[PDB]
């Protein structure tokens, strides 16, 4: 932490700076967009936007 999250579900990138993530994968969250629907995160595979409710804080 204090910004460490884990993916709840698979999410396939749809372009537009989004990031593919796999259930169980760890992320570090940089922040959220204006309405909180999108979350900008970093994983071992890169950096991009993922659905906010597709992840949850761990540790």
């Amino acid at each position: 932490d204090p910004n460490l999250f884990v993916a709840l579900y698979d999410f396939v990138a749809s372009g537009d700076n989004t990031l593919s993530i796999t259930k169980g994968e760890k992320l570090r969250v940089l922040g959220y967009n204006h309405n909180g629907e999108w979350c900008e995160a970093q994983t071992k595979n890169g950096q991009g936007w993922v659905p906010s409710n597709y992840i949850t804080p761990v540790n």
């Binding site: 709840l8 579900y9 999410f11 749809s14 537009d16 700076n17 989004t18 967009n33 204006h34 629907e37 999108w38 900008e40 936007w49 993922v50 659905p51 906010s52 409710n53 597709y54």
Partner: peptide, 10 residues
């Protein structure tokens, strides 16, 4: 961030 909404869970 994208200007369209993300897919709903799950």
């Amino acid at each position: 961030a994208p200007t369209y909404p993300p897919p709903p869970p799950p």
